[PDB]
Ligand binder design. Sequence first.
Ligand SMILES: Nc1ncnc2c1ncn2[C@@H]1O[C@H](COP(=O)(O)OP(=O)(O)OP(O)(O)=S)[C@@H](O)[C@H]1O
Ligand SMILES: Nc1ncnc2c1ncn2[C@@H]1O[C@H](COP(=O)(O)OP(=O)(O)OP(O)(O)=S)[C@@H](O)[C@H]1O
Ligand SMILES: Nc1ncnc2c1ncn2[C@@H]1O[C@H](COP(=O)(O)OP(=O)(O)OP(O)(O)=S)[C@@H](O)[C@H]1O
Ligand SMILES: Nc1ncnc2c1ncn2[C@@H]1O[C@H](COP(=O)(O)OP(=O)(O)O)[C@@H](O)[C@H]1O
Ligand SMILES: [Mg+2]
Ligand SMILES: [Mg+2]
Ligand SMILES: [Mg+2]
Lengths: 348, 104, 536, 328, 319
Amino acid sequence: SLWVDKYRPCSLGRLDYHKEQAAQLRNLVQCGDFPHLLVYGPSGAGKKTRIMCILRELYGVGVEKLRIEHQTITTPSKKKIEISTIASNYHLEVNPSDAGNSDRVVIQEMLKTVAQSQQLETNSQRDFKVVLLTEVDKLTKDAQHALRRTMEKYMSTCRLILCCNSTSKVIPPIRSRCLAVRVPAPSIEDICHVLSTVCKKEGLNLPSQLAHRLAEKSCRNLRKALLMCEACRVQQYPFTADQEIPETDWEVYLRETANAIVSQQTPQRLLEVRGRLYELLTHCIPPEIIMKGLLSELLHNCDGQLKGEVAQMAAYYEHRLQLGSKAIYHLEAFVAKFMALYKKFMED
Amino acid sequence: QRVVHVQQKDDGCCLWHLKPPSCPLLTKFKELNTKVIDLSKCGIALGEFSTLNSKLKSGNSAAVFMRTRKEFTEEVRNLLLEEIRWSNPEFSLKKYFPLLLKKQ
Amino acid sequence: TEDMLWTEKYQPQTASELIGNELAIKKLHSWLKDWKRRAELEERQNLKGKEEESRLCNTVLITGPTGVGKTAAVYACAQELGFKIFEVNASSQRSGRQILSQLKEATQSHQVDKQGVNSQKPCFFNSKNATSLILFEEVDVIFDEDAGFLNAIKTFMATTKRPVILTTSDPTFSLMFDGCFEEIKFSTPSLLNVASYLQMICLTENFRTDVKDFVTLLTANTCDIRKSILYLQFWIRSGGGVLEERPLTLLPKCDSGCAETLFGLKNIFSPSEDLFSFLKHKITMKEEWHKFIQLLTEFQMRNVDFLYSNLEFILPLPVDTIPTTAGKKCSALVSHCLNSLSEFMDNMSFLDALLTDVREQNKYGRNDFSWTNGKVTSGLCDEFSLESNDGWTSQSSGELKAAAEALSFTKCSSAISKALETLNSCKKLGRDPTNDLTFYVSQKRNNVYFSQSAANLDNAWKRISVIKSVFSSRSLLYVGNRQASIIEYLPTLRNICKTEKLKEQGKSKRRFLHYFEGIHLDIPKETVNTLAADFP
Amino acid sequence: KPVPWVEKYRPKCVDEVAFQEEVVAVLKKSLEGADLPNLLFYGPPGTGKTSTILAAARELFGPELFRLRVLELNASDERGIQVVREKVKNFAQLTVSGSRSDGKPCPPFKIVILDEADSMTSAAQAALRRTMEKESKTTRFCLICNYVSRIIEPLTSRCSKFRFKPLSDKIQQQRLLDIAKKENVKISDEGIAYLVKVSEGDLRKAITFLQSATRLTGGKEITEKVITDIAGVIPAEKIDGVFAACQSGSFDKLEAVVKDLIDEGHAATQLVNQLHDVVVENNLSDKQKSIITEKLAEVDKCLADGADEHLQLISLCATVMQQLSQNC
Amino acid sequence: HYELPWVEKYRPVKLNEIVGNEDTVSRLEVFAREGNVPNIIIAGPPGTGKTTSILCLARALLGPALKDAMLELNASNDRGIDVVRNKIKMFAQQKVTLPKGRHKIIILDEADSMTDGAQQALRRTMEIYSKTTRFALACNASDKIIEPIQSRCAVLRYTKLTDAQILTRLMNVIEKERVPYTDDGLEAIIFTAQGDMRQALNNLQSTFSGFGFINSENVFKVCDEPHPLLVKEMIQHCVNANIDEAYKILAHLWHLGYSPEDIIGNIFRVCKTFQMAEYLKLEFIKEIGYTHMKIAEGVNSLLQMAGLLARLCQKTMAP
Ligand SMILES: Nc1ncnc2c1ncn2[C@@H]1O[C@H](COP(=O)(O)OP(=O)(O)OP(O)(O)=S)[C@@H](O)[C@H]1O
Ligand SMILES: Nc1ncnc2c1ncn2[C@@H]1O[C@H](COP(=O)(O)OP(=O)(O)OP(O)(O)=S)[C@@H](O)[C@H]1O
Ligand SMILES: Nc1ncnc2c1ncn2[C@@H]1O[C@H](COP(=O)(O)OP(=O)(O)OP(O)(O)=S)[C@@H](O)[C@H]1O
Ligand SMILES: Nc1ncnc2c1ncn2[C@@H]1O[C@H](COP(=O)(O)OP(=O)(O)O)[C@@H](O)[C@H]1O
Ligand SMILES: [Mg+2]
Ligand SMILES: [Mg+2]
Ligand SMILES: [Mg+2]
């Protein structure tokens, strides 16, 4: 595997940064009253690594013995939805937002089943089985109410760890029942130290300047920094101080899209950007990320007073994008309105 | 069963005893007469709320087919086969059409 | 003077008569030919008397979309190779005791009558030598009265001596079913092959049809061959759509206009009326507005936006296929046209976000363009939905969205046309802004009359397949995050594959090809080549 | 096996609920007559409503009969009211026997505690009214809400209404200090005061945060940092930085401050809450306060719908910066 | 001994007595004359003519063999998985002597009420027994019918009846019953029946049974909807930005007890045919749709309708 999957820490003493937080997570399991966790923060800060560390500290080493199961669940409209689940002998892991508006359904029955699983399985190790709900911030209001009901019902038999990146969408009834674990992103020095630690295990000696460039260009994303270090290791055997960091392909695609938006403001260019955003969306890139990158590069090419108007317009159409079922409509609404505003601004 | 309302009154808050405002906006209350037009007095004409017209079409519809599709002659049949083969150059027309002719 | 449906009148009696899925047809025909050879060798051994290398599994499984031809291919192959099909449908009570005690002896015992009219293939119900062959049709359909049916077909795996064929349309049935069987996948056939097939069956009925109308019908019903055959039978036997002679060489009349009949647009429009001419011309009359609202309402019941999906052709703007007072009047036309287009797109965003849809989108899976949705199967029980639903909202929201979309389109089209008649002054000035007012459309959206989707769904499905096949390797299978996987792991994988391809094309060491083997990644080589091409 | 300190340290009996005088008095005179009327407790969260109704249940019933003959449902069920109607119908039809060894017989009725009753729409409230007027003698209801005005007139007319006032911060600090002395955790009075402040009068959230901090710290002292990051509250330094970036008039440093807040894991709804608390309690003009608070409400609504934190926060900070630099 | 309703007394007995949906009804007519009808599914709004056209087509195909060659099943019948497996298959395997080109017909009315399991169990029955038996299904929501069943049937879309066709059938009924009428009453009846001929005939018969004269007072007394004159005056006051008189009309409608859904539906129906400019009509329909989305989402009050009226006035007061 890669260094993002092979050199990942498994124990709570192996976590290089957030040592005080890792120590508090170590004493969290010693009391035996391990509650539901709400592990939130930016992407790639070290969230899932810390969940795996807590799961290893809770049970034995058998949590690393992983497998994949498929479960078919019947909706109340008499339809069947099949979902995937990472599983072990002691824990569970599912992305319940994969079932759309029926997420509540795979919220209910699945935890019901695993509760019955802990009613059947006996090993005298731990009283509960931990289920990892990934992307709780993508759950609908009905799904989150069903989650509140399920956590209140099956608390004694199973435990829940909610891994999200945004607690804003998470309803206050959910947040009032789980212990909050904020995992902020590692700093530049933390990313450089982790990169040097990982690169030393391969017998390679990267310089501090290349590590600082990788830390700066990753926007405090440890997974992205490690994977860019993997790409740099693939590109060259020695690590020069001026080694070129390979940029992300869809990122430069979005950059070219925004230069296409800025350069020409015509209906033909609007349809060209329409094709470009369609081809970006066919690659399963989320429209929020497309909107964020587009807004960043348009604010690169905007004026002083126009930045606030463009940002408010982008936030407006991103909220409308979250409201509508077809996000492409709101993407091109933002693009066309920005083109009109830009053409009006450059005319005087 | 008898009902009761319990509000633990605190005299120091001074919001329990509230008097009507003395400002002229909330003193002079505007009056709405609640008078509406009678509904069988005006009347509705044809096509007022629909797409109705006084003129109705006649002879432009109810055309029965009564079609007699003549059998296609051989030369026209191969001409149409060549047209379909030009439309789809990668299709195997010669190995399907005689078999469907046998199927008919 | 005919009493047969066109599906069974034009049923393929030979395996070469089926359209598409040639690899699956060849695999099934080879499997059944090997079984027939084993049966004939068994007969020869009986005449004489009185298996890892072969690897001939006792059972095939066939999966694909609905109406693609799984049962038709099975019947054609069994007819060609002389098998006798014993069919078990969901249309008869098939519980374990009955199916075992009434059809095990077909596999385990000889046929008492081996010659004659026994090539006819019967069914199963309980209220030259011909080899027996079981066909479980629609195995995914399991009822409560079919108790122990899965255990019974497992016993049929274990203790058969004659072949078993399973037909299913559920894509995930082969996951939950435990056993040994040869898997056969039926893919959706291409548009043009089925279009030429339908043109062939129409030309046998002495009709001339164009390819584009059949392509619109087939992309409307998603290449369901049986559905298109049956609707073709209904439409041809009722007299066709519209008398229009099209002289083409590439003589009888042509009969274009079947797709509009399929969507029910001919119950609204007059026969003299044309949909494209109706949308292009300026509407003023009340009856014309009623017709437009009814047309748009008929398209909103399907949750398909008609005008925006075909935006370039229906607009009064130039469309190309992909391969100072004068200055103020050149700029004002483009500025007004962009303003009206932006207003229309804002209107469509308003209708998509702040207006109710009649069908609640992302109900069982998430939004479009996602490989994480899974499979949604229809109901297998005899119980009703029993949930509260609002019929008045579904009745009124379609008309509301249709009226608002029609008014938005008419405002936008009038604004762009009242911008466009002043382009003659710019043309007289020697400057051509029409290169900026044009629309560049793809060939996929140009070979059809009207489209129900403005995106490349084939490219989307190819990207979905490559995303699934990347993250189904055993090393990447335990990655917790999914959109973060395709946003962080996948671009680095594409860059690694590009660098590996550049190293291979530079005549470097062959150990660099084993870099994925050096880190022990299990990505298939076709997927490694696909990631190494580009990021389009 | 251990229970949370919210459940463990709620009062066992009626008149142990402090700072509620009249509600406890009428509940006592209902206990004396052994008949509990329909109840409607409204007040701020964490003020002793569930504690009072449960204490009335445990002292009217037996300790072993308390959990069997009451039913606590949550009225914000996402499957409509008919599912809750099914639970109330099943619990009213189901009957269990009761016998107390203390010499007092059990009442013939039963207790249904409908929590967050204010979240039910008026149609669902009218649907529930049929159930409570069709099972009046054999079943009594207690609706727990925070706003009595959200409960419709046919319900509120037939219920007995009680208002729960919040305890003062001194009383909350005293109860938290008693809890910490009971559970043997080293914590000064300043940390308890900051806990009561950061809970905003919510004793339930204060006890939850205290128990969670004792679990997290591993037997050390409870610092201010662990209380701050266990409550999800942004420190005031970041709020002052946001306001300084808004008053400066530079959009680039505004983006830098917002991206710094996003990188630290802090929520956007919490930032909107802190910004609203700062704005409405300062020396801004009424027009500035009006525009800023309207934009804050719009941004909060957009964040509740699931919109991205970064874009909404950037738009709100642009509005606040424009309104603050309008005086320039 | 009772008066039969005009929906049954004047029910069509042939396929040329059916107004509206001219193309599909004509195709059914040529199939009834020629024979060999395929398995059909007829989808459309209520009151369109689906059951009538299916029954008339079956009658014209069969003739005297109706009592033995036709099997009809409504939603009041069982139509379960076991019914599909025994009764449907037994009728399909049943021998019935018919002229060549004519088959036995299984009519499944209200196919939305069929369970998904029964539709899955009826898939092969629609296929093998197609040389002796045909299936004619009628449905309102075609999405309730599963895709494998829709693959084996030709789906024919019925659209709402245009008001001219309803007017022609209404004058046919009036001239055959000597009912005095006015054009006011005919327009009122046509407005009350939104493309529903069954509703139009029921409204006409109820009006004649109640008062015997067809005028808008009697018609809207019989139906008791929000009167389109009040809604027209309210929309006209919103056009003139007269928020007080428009709210007077709206509060009068609210105190009359009409539901918010009925009020917003009547508002949309009147504003669809209202005489105003194109852009103003577009903003009016946009605000009506946004308010109706709010009504459907759960928030419905006089505050929401007053906010809609204020937004409509703001559309006039703002360029
Ligand atoms: N590839 C094909 N070539 C020719 N005819 C076809 C083809 N596919 C379908 N048909 C026709 O459609 C009829 C029914 O198709 P089936 O094979 O029963 O569909 P299916 O693959 O079994 O999918 P199901 O069973 O409906 S889920 C056949 O009898 C043929 O007349
Ligand atoms: N007046 C009071 N007397 C005694 N304990 C109190 C009082 N007010 C609050 N508490 C304590 O505060 C905690 C929470 O109060 P509860 O009554 O259980 O919940 P709550 O007041 O209903 O808040 P909700 O349910 O979220 S609306 C419990 O530990 C109670 O013991
Ligand atoms: N197109 C029509 N032409 C003439 N009368 C019609 C027409 N449609 C409906 N009617 C009348 O309305 C009555 C009931 O209509 P039906 O056709 O039986 O209902 P339907 O069209 O099947 O709609 P649903 O979905 O079953 S409610 C008929 O008996 C006729 O009197
Ligand atoms: N303390 C640490 N020391 C070394 N490597 C780490 C540490 N924390 C995280 N990593 C590496 O960074 C990656 C973190 O990704 P992950 O936490 O799964 O993303 P997310 O936070 O979005 O779930 C892991 O692949 C792991 O190898
Ligand atoms: Mg089949
Ligand atoms: Mg409570
Ligand atoms: Mg009917």
